[PDB]
Amino acid sequence: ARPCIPKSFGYSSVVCVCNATYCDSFDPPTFPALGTFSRYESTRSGRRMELSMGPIQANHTGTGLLLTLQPEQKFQKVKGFGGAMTDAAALNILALSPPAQNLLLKSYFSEEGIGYNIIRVPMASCDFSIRTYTYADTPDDFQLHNFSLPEEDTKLKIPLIHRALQLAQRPVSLLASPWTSPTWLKTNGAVNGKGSLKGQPGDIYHQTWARYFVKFLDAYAEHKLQFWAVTAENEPSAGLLSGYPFQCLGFTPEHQRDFIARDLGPTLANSTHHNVRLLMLDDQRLLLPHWAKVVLTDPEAAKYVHGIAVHWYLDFLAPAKATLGETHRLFPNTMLFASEACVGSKFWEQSVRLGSWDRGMQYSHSIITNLLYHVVGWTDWNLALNPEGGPNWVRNFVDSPIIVDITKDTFYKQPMFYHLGHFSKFIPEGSQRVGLVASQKNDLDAVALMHPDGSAVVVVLNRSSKDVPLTIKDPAVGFLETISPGYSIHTYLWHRQ
Amino acid sequence: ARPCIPKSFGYSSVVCVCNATYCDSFDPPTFPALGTFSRYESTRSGRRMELSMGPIQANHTGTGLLLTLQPEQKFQKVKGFGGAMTDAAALNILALSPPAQNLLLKSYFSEEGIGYNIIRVPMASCDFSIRTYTYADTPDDFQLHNFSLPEEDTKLKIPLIHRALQLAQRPVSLLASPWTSPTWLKTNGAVNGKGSLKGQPGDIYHQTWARYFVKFLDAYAEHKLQFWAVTAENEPSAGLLSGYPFQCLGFTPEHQRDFIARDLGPTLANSTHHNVRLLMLDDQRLLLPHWAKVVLTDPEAAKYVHGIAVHWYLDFLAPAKATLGETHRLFPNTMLFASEACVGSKFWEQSVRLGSWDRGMQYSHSIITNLLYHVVGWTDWNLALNPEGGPNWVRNFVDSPIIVDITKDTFYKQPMFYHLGHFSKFIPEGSQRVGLVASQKNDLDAVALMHPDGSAVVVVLNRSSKDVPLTIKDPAVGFLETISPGYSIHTYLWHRQ
Ligand SMILES: *[C@@H]1O[C@H](CO)[C@@H](O)[C@H](O)[C@H]1NC(C)=O
Numbered sequence: 001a002r003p004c005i006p007k008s009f010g011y012s013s014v015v016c017v018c019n020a021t022y023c024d025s026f027d028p029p030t031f032p033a034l035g036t037f038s039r040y041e042s043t044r045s046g047r048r049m050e051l052s053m054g055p056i057q058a059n060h061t062g063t064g065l066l067l068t069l070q071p072e073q074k075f076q077k078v079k080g081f082g083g084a085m086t087d088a089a090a091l092n093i094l095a096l097s098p099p100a101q102n103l104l105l106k107s108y109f110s111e112e113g114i115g116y117n118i119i120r121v122p123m124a125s126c127d128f129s130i131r132t133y134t135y136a137d138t139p140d141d142f143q144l145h146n147f148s149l150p151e152e153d154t155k156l157k158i159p160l161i162h163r164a165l166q167l168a169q170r171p172v173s174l175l176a177s178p179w180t181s182p183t184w185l186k187t188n189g190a191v192n193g194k195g196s197l198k199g200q201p202g203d204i205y206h207q208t209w210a211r212y213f214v215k216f217l218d219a220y221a222e223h224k225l226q227f228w229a230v231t232a233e234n235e236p237s238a239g240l241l242s243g244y245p246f247q248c249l250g251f252t253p254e255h256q257r258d259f260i261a262r263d264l265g266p267t268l269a270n271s272t273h274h275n276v277r278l279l280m281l282d283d284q285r286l287l288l289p290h291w292a293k294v295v296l297t298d299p300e301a302a303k304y305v306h307g308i309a310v311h312w313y314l315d316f317l318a319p320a321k322a323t324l325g326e327t328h329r330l331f332p333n334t335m336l337f338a339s340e341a342c343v344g345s346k347f348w349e350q351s352v353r354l355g356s357w358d359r360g361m362q363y364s365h366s367i368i369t370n371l372l373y374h375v376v377g378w379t380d381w382n383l384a385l386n387p388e389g390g391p392n393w394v395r396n397f398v399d400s401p402i403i404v405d406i407t408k409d410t411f412y413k414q415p416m417f418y419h420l421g422h423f424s425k426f427i428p429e430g431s432q433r434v435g436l437v438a439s440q441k442n443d444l445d446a447v448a449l450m451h452p453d454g455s456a457v458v459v460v461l462n463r464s465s466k467d468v469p470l471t472i473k474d475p476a477v478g479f480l481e482t483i484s485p486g487y488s489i490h491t492y493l494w495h496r497q
Numbered sequence: 498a499r500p501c502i503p504k505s506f507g508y509s510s511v512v513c514v515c516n517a518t519y520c521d522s523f524d525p526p527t528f529p530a531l532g533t534f535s536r537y538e539s540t541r542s543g544r545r546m547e548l549s550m551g552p553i554q555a556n557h558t559g560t561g562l563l564l565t566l567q568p569e570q571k572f573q574k575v576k577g578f579g580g581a582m583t584d585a586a587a588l589n590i591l592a593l594s595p596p597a598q599n600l601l602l603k604s605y606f607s608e609e610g611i612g613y614n615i616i617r618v619p620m621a622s623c624d625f626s627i628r629t630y631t632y633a634d635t636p637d638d639f640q641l642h643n644f645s646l647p648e649e650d651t652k653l654k655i656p657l658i659h660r661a662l663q664l665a666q667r668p669v670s671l672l673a674s675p676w677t678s679p680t681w682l683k684t685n686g687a688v689n690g691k692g693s694l695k696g697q698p699g700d701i702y703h704q705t706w707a708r709y710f711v712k713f714l715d716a717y718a719e720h721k722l723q724f725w726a727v728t729a730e731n732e733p734s735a736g737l738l739s740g741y742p743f744q745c746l747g748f749t750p751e752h753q754r755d756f757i758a759r760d761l762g763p764t765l766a767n768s769t770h771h772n773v774r775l776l777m778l779d780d781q782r783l784l785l786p787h788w789a790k791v792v793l794t795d796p797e798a799a800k801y802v803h804g805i806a807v808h809w810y811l812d813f814l815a816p817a818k819a820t821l822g823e824t825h826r827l828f829p830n831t832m833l834f835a836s837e838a839c840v841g842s843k844f845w846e847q848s849v850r851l852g853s854w855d856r857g858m859q860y861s862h863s864i865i866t867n868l869l870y871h872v873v874g875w876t877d878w879n880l881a882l883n884p885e886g887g888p889n890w891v892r893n894f895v896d897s898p899i900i901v902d903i904t905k906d907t908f909y910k911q912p913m914f915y916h917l918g919h920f921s922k923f924i925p926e927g928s929q930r931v932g933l934v935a936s937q938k939n940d941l942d943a944v945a946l947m948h949p950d951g952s953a954v955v956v957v958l959n960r961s962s963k964d965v966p967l968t969i970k971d972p973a974v975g976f977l978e979t980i981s982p983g984y985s986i987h988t989y990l991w992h993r994q
């Protein structure tokens with residue numbers, strides 16, 4: 001039921017206007033019958049994940065672009081896709097009337113929407129907060145006696161997450177990251193700027209900080225929320241730079257290694273939270289593989305690290321083979337996970353461009369590239385923001401897939417949302433990326449995966465302005481003849497048996 | 498001859514204050530006997546290329562790091578060091594009273610200063626202009642009859658360049674680069690944003706554009722100025738991004754190749770300017786090696802390309818090994834030159850930081866890294882800016898080694914100026930990079946060169962906060978005992994015979 005209500009704001013494409021009584025949604029999912037395929041299409045001209053189906057052909061009579069599926073070339077398994085429940089996202093969602101709130105959550109979490117199964121949760125404040133605070137703001141409180149959650153957790157974030165879980169049919173995984181420690185644990189005594197933990201790994205500052213993870217997890221467990229994973233620190237490299245404008249805590253790779261080895265790993269291992277995974281890095285991929293070499297060749301640290309979390313500034317450009325590829329080569333049993341991505345912030349261009357096709361294309365290009373270099377999940381940044389791209393106490397505004405307009409009790413679904421949906425909606429946890437080869441150089445971006453039930457899903461992004469005719473071959477079934485219109489993204493699904 | 502007059506503005510180091518009647522300057526160089534070395538020292542604590550001399554002993558007193566000269570390992574030969582005579586630089590210089598103008602010119606170009614020997618010169622307007630213009634703004638003038646130089650050239654740039662050549666130690670080379678063509682040759686009809694030359698290589702538009710290069714060289718030659726080299730286009734990748742705010746002209750690597758092959762090479766070869774070198778790319782190193790593969794494997798393109806020009810801004814998305822290192826491996830006889838050696842310039846920071854040591858250390862680290870990855874030359878960007886980092890008709894962002902304060906008839910020499918000088922002053926054209934072997938893992942950056950007269954120069958940059966004890970060995974001479982203070986840069990000079 002219910003198509004997108006489009007509105008142009010002068011940019012390349014439209015947004016979809018949602019309010020208290022109306023929001024675009026999908027019908028509950030059917031699967032195509034064996035011998036047919038399903039196609040979801042989004043265009044810069046305005047199609048929004050439209051469902052169509054076609055026949056799978058037995059024969060293909062040469063000789064244009066062919067993408068061959070390689071079912072037996074088996075790669076990484078997928079953890080999931082989601083975004084971040086920041087103070088700012090929660091604050092915006094809740095500023096809406098209760099019914100508009102539900103249509104917004106259903107868009108991300110339910111099967112009537114794009115079926116996210118990951119939520120990233122800051123541990124205390126970040127730049128997407130309207131005040132700086134930690135859970136332990138009493139100075140020198142080493143025992144953590146005045147550890148508590150503020151209203152941001154108890155009245156905003158946690159009630160929202162619960163509502164997300166009730167809406168979702170997929171199991172949802174929670175991921176936690178700290179931006180800063182209490183200031184009394186830090187060399188510079190401030191939430192921002194250059195500074196790291198006082199003293200050295202093994203000592204009372206480091207033990208206290210490690211205990212602060214356990215106290216956080218207990219506080220959330222009391223509200224009936226259990227975490228899948230935590231990261232060692234959000235963007236540890238940030239806290240090494242003088243003048244770093246917002247919450248941060250500096251770790252060189254050697255500091256992070258020793259911190260995990262001496263403190264964070266054992267503290268977590270000897271707690272009721274021993275099943276929580278620990279991810280290292282949580283920072284720009286350009287720090288790989290070096291960061292991974294320092295930490296993971298230390299067996300005392302490696303025994304506790306489940307994975308490597310990476311960030312990207314979406315405005316800026318790769319190679320990825322030299323980072324993600326090499327990291328995987330070196331540590332094939334250590335999963336890579338994209339924990340944050342956002343589109344800026346060009347300068348030049350506004351923080352929020354309502355309707356930007358380019359920004360959407362930047363998301364799917366990124367997800368595809370990540371998928372092709374072994375990455376197992378992709379977590380977007382703020383779930384929702386206002387039209388200024390905030391609130392953000394440091395004015396570090398960015399874009400988000402859903403923009404809330406509180407004065408009108410409406411929200412807008414950006415192209416980013418749909419570009420994300422082409423992946424989150426159809427690649428459940430346990431899907432496995434398989435091989436896909438091109439018959440000739442082309443302008444498309446594609447990735448192929450196997451759904452845990454054996455069915456296929458292939459995403460095809462066309463960043464050129466020209467329609468590109470293509471066929472996909474899957475030896476088990478035959479041929480999918482199709483066209484990828486210029487400036488479009490399609491997801492193709494079909495049974496193999 | 499005259500020491501630095503220090504002033505703080507509340508950052509890590511000081512600047513040197515210069516005015517109509519005082520500038521810090523050097524005495525002519527000296528040729529100390531065999532066994533004696535010269536040290537020039539700058540420190541964050543305030544010392545500014547301070548001269549001292551010491552012994553090279555037969556005995557080794559030190560027990561820490563050893564750097565050993567290996568004069569027989571020979572590497573690239575140096576073209577030289579310089580900066581950009583943009584509109585903004587010219588306006589800033591010329592707003593000083595004439596005695597202050599010469600002190601500032603002498604600072605860069607003279608033996609009393611740091612001996613630049615390259616100047617980069619934009620072909621018409623760029624963002625560091627106070628208005629948009631090209632040399633051929635009257636439409637559909639394919640024969641470029643109305644081609645002429647505005648007062649920006651004839652009144653500002655050219656007289657300053659003449660003055661610099663009069664003042665200079667060394668022969669100075671000029672390097673030219675265009676930002677945009679006349680807009681009536683462009684797909685988009687605009688000085689900026691996403692747009693190329695109309696049509697395809699070989700046609701009338703590409704032919705007129707190529708003739709524009711020759712008209713420029715002719716025009717400058719009437720003023721009695723010959724160029725060493727031109728680039729194909731300043732930052733061609735920029736004109737591929739929609740909304741790009743500064744003057745630009747987009748070329749894909751393929752387009753650059755065919756343009757050079759069909760038009761820009763043959764046109765310059767058939768002219769009295771056939772000796773002018775052509776550099777390709779002139780962009781961020783992250784487009785390497787790809788761009789070099791695209792252009793230099795076409796032998797119709799390759800025969801015209803003398804070398805590859807690179808910019809530093811986005812180096813942090815790199816790194817050098819994968820871009821510069823690899824490009825040298827694939828094309829060992831094509832020189833790498835840094836055509837815009839600046840800065841970046843973190844998002845929370847003010848445009849100009851008077852007395853920022855950190856930006857200084859970024860320059861020298863970056864020259865060192867360039868040197869260890871085969872780079873033969875450097876052009877810094879604006880020779881001078883105002884304290885707002887302008888004038889720029891679009892936006893301020895970058896610092897400059899000299900900041901002019903016209904209301905006070907004074908200019909400030911930033912730590913950048915001295916970091917640049919530690920190289921440009923002591924490393925003349927024809928110098929050759931040579932082996933320098935570190936005996937053990939250490940925190941310093943170092944490079945060694947051989948002066949064309951056979952003497953050694955070694956630059957040692959210490960970016961850590963700790964003093965590092967150090968010995969330098971010349972197999973032909975002995976051991977030089979020294980200390981590299983934290984946050985310091987030294988250059989050592991000694992005769993080898
Ligand atoms: C909700 O949006 C639909 C447009 O889809 C419209 O018919 C209705 O008026 C809107 N409600 C409000 C309160 O604006």
Ligand SMILES: *[C@@H]1O[C@H](CO)[C@@H](O)[C@H](O)[C@H]1NC(C)=O
Pocket residue numbers: 502515516517518519
């Ligand atoms: C120029 O600088 C010198 C040295 O600091 C100083 O003696 C002189 O007063 C300055 N001139 C003016 C006009 O301030």
Ligand SMILES: OCCN1C[C@H](O)[C@@H](O)[C@H](O)[C@@H](O)C1
Pocket residue numbers: 126127128234235311312313340341342381396398
């Ligand atoms: O991957 C992009 C880098 N992040 C930018 C984001 O805007 C910030 O709010 C966030 O707090 C940081 O983790 C850094």
